Amino acid sequence: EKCETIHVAIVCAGYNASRDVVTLVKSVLFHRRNPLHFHLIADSIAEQILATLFQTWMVPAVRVDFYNADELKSEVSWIPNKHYSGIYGLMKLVLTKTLPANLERVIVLDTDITFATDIAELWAVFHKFKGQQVLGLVENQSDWYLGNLWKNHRPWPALGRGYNTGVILLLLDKLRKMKWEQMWRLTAERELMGMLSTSLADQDIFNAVIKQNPFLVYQLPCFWNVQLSDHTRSEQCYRDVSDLKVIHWNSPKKLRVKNKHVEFFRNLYLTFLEYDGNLLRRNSENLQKQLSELDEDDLCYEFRRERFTVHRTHLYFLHYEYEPAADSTDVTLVAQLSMDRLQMLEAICKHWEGPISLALYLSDAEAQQFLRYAQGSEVLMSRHNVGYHIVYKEGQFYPVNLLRNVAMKHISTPYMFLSDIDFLPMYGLYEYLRKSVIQLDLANTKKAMIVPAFETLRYRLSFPKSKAELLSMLDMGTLFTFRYHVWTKGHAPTNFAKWRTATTPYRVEWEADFEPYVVVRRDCPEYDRRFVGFGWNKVAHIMELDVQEYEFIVLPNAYMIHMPHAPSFDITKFRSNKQYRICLKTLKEEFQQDMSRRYGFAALKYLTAENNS
């Protein structure tokens, strides 16, 4: 009917799979022509990642339904397995019970597949099933089951070379009809009485129920999944580029394998592993209705256009693991960055010790480059507790607030710290703020902690170690208060003069254009989307913290030393475009009046200050 709403099922388990299903879905969608409907069996972490990802793509004619695996985990718990994927591999057979009875046919695909062609043609194979051919599989393209690869090998019984369950084409309705659960269960225990465990997890069990009843299978043509292993024989299963339709990269080495034409296959792989998904995307009604009233005649309307724009967010790109402590007083950094500021990560990785978040902002190709880089550095790899929240590129402006609030919402500790990637904290600051949070006891009251700012110009500076050493180095003064020659009010209002002699934190009121760096509990407000780029950005958040009656505490025994960095493009554009400035000022008026409306008299002070200045 040209629109049958093709149905798919994918097993996701672990962060690696969570991030490989992205590539598989890219491959399927690239050649799509009719509506799709996925069905991802996911654990909690994969559930969150993929929920956010798909809810952010805004794909058309595509739907996503997530099925819990924790409840269905026990079903196969009695089947020992040895596959590197884990116990989640076997579960690809319980789909009949898990999926709804109202569905008929699903292309069960493993994560690593990649389709070079539309899945419509593969779906078409559902018009060639005859007799009691209810499953759909392909002949194995290896010698694993033949029992001749090496001496003393005892593969589980199978028909000829065996089959690889990379792609399965099912008739759910039928399997439900003829009592599918019990016979495969019976075969399962029947084939486990003699030996220890399976060798390929689900792939093994299916082969059993393939061998015992050979009238269910349907020997699809070999070129539906060109299995590539260390002993591949796909050369006879393809002749040219056009014939290939689908690939399976079954190897622990993955991309390090060697073949006669591995170059072309790898090039194709990178074609879609690097394709700009933000282009494939062609909640919706409200979004479009907001887009309706939008006017193109405003000075900086584009700020309004970008205020509510939705960007593809792929949360937790790389592995992440964290065990919360009993104290319940942890802190985690957050920061935006792009290419120009990557190098600082190592430095920050050499500074922090606890978890940090990061709203890393790159295109797809730069995202893969970062993947390689983070897979290279030993310091990054050894650090488990560093999240990597990716927000892909789109539009022209820089949605910095979007990046920082995306990093805000997803944190695994109660309190948090706001900064930028440039700043480099102390050594041991993690324990310092641990003790400080414990002592000031913010678990009850409402307070903010500020770490003062600075800036130096000695690239090869020895890392200071003690407050008294900073006193000596300021008496000599090699580095100065951050932005001491452009924006004195940025951090001068901290009144550094009294900082020196202090031994305990001191409170400070608000001042014109006061934009410190704060530590605060998670409840602190998100940023205002109206402002994208550089300029008058943090001070909005500061205004909200202040107007919520947050007392500003400045920590005595900490500080930050800006590591010099090259100028970026946002600052140059801000300093060059006057229209940017005037529309920023009108946005200032708008924000101030909205603040007044939402709180009332208390917010008038800012206005009065603007009237006084």
Binding residues for Mn(2+), as ranges, are 110, 112, 420, 422
Query: Smallest distance from the beta carbon of 344 to Mn ion, in angstroms?
Result: 11
| Interface segment toward its own copies; rule CB under 8 A; list 134-142, 148-156, 221-229, 276-284 | 276-284
By CB under 8 A, the count of residues binding its own copies is: 34
Q: Which is nearer to its own copies, 300 or 555 (CB)?
A: 300
116 binds, among Mn ion, its own copies, none (CB under 5 to 8 A by kind): none
Measured CA to CA, the distance from residue 47 to residue 496 in angstroms comes to 48
- From residue 454, alpha-carbon distances to 232, 332, 392, 491, 496 in Å are 60, 21, 31, 8, 11
Q: What beta strand segments (E) does 76-136 contain?
A: 107-109, 114-115
Does 81 participate in binding Mn ion (rule CB under 5 A)?
no
- State the amino acid at position 464 in one-letter form: P
Query: In sequence order, which residues have a C-beta less than 8 Å from that of residue 179 and are 6 or more positions away?
Result: none
The answer to whether the beta carbons of residues 521 and 448 sit under 8 Å apart is no
Q: Which is nearer to its own copies, 270 or 512 (CB)?
A: 270
Q: Which is nearer to its own copies, 360 or 595 (CB)?
A: 360
Does 459 participate in binding its own copies (rule CB under 8 A)?
yes
- Selected from 179, 256, 260, 282, the binder of its own copies by CB under 8 A is 282
592 binds, among its own copies, Mn ion, none (CB under 5 to 8 A by kind): none
Query: Smallest distance from the beta carbon of 249 to its own copies, in angstroms?
Result: 18
Query: Smallest distance from the beta carbon of 111 to Mn ion, in angstroms?
Result: 8
Does 279 participate in binding its own copies (rule CB under 8 A)?
yes
Does 58 participate in binding its own copies (rule CB under 8 A)?
no
475: left (phi > 0), else alpha (psi -120 to 50), else beta?
alpha
Does 274 participate in binding its own copies (rule CB under 8 A)?
yes
The answer to whether the beta carbons of residues 144 and 162 sit under 8 Å apart is yes
| Interface segment toward Mn ion; rule CB under 5 A; list 186-194, 341-349, 366-374, 416-424 | 416-424
Residues 1-40 vs Mn ion: string with x where CB under 5 A? ----------------------------------------
Measured CA to CA, the distance from residue 277 to residue 275 in angstroms comes to 6
Q: Which is nearer to its own copies, 132 or 572 (CB)?
A: 572
Residues 525-564 vs Mn ion: string with x where CB under 5 A? ----------------------------------------
Instruction: Let me know if 51 is exposed, middle or buried by CB neighbors in 10 A (0-12, 13-18, 19+).
Output: middle
Q: Which is nearer to its own copies, 271 or 592 (CB)?
A: 271
Residues 372-401 vs its own copies: string with x where CB under 8 A? -x--x----------------x--------
Q: Which is nearer to its own copies, 468 or 566 (CB)?
A: 566
Ranges within 234-293 binding Mn ion (CB under 5 A): 250
Q: Tokens at residue 438, please?
A: 């414990």
Query: Smallest distance from the beta carbon of 165 to Mn ion, in angstroms?
Result: 8
Does 438 participate in binding its own copies (rule CB under 8 A)?
no
The answer to whether the beta carbons of residues 41 and 150 sit under 8 Å apart is no
- From residue 471, alpha-carbon distances to 114, 217, 453 in Å are 60, 79, 15
- Selected from 68, 290, 343, 375, the binder of its own copies by CB under 8 A is 343
Measured CA to CA, the distance from residue 349 to residue 421 in angstroms comes to 11
Ranges within 564-583 binding its own copies (CB under 8 A): 564-569, 572, 576
Q: Which is nearer to its own copies, 279 or 326 (CB)?
A: 279
Does 111 participate in binding Mn ion (rule CB under 5 A)?
no
- Comparing C-alpha atoms, which of 198, 225, 209 is closest to residue 90? 198
| Interface segment toward its own copies; rule CB under 8 A; list 139-147, 368-376, 398-406, 410-418 | 368-376
363 binds, among Mn ion, its own copies, none (CB under 5 to 8 A by kind): its own copies
250 binds, among its own copies, Mn ion, none (CB under 5 to 8 A by kind): Mn ion
The answer to whether the beta carbons of residues 175 and 129 sit under 8 Å apart is no
Using a CB cutoff of 8 Å and minimum separation of 24, what contacts does 130-133 make? 131/215, 132/215, 132/216, 133/215, 133/216, 133/217, 133/218
Query: Smallest distance from the beta carbon of 352 to Mn ion, in angstroms?
Result: 19
Angle CA(454)–CA(457)–CA(461) in degrees, nearest 5? Answer: 95
- Comparing C-alpha atoms, which of 10, 123, 106, 26 is closest to residue 66? 10
| Interface segment toward its own copies; rule CB under 8 A; list 133-141, 337-345, 493-501, 592-600 | 337-345
Q: Which is nearer to Mn ion, 110 or 204 (CB)?
A: 110
Q: Which residues pair with 40 in a beta bridge?
A: 10, 66
The answer to whether the beta carbons of residues 312 and 53 sit under 8 Å apart is yes
**Cβ neighbours around 466 below 10 Å, total:** 10
Does 486 participate in binding its own copies (rule CB under 8 A)?
no
Angle of the 578-599 helix axis to the 538-547 helix axis, nearest 10? 10
Residues comprising the binding site? Answer: 110, 112, 420, 422
Measured CA to CA, the distance from residue 183 to residue 46 in angstroms comes to 31
495 binds, among Mn ion, its own copies, none (CB under 5 to 8 A by kind): none
Using a CB cutoff of 8 Å and minimum separation of 24, what contacts does 536-544 make? 536/584, 536/587, 536/588, 537/400, 537/401, 538/418, 539/513, 539/514, 539/515, 540/591, 541/418, 542/510, 542/514, 542/515, 542/516, 542/518, 543/591, 543/595, 543/606, 544/595
- Selected from 178, 183, 186, 270, the binder of its own copies by CB under 8 A is 270
Residue 349's SS3 state is: helix
Q: Which is nearer to Mn ion, 58 or 492 (CB)?
A: 492
296 binds, among its own copies, Mn ion, none (CB under 5 to 8 A by kind): its own copies
Residues 286-305 vs its own copies: string with x where CB under 8 A? ----------x---------
Measured CA to CA, the distance from residue 564 to residue 423 in angstroms comes to 9
Pairing of strands 226-227, 246-248: parallel
Query: Smallest distance from the beta carbon of 299 to its own copies, in angstroms?
Result: 16
Counting every residue written for the chain, the total comes to 613
Instruction: Let me know if 607 is exposed, middle or buried by CB neighbors in 10 A (0-12, 13-18, 19+).
Output: middle
Instruction: Using CB under 8 A, list all residues that contact its own copies.
Output: 241, 258, 264, 267-268, 270-271, 274, 276, 279, 281-282, 296, 339-340, 343, 363, 365-366, 369, 373, 376, 393, 457-459, 564-569, 572, 576
Binding site for Mn ion (CB under 5 A): 110, 250, 422
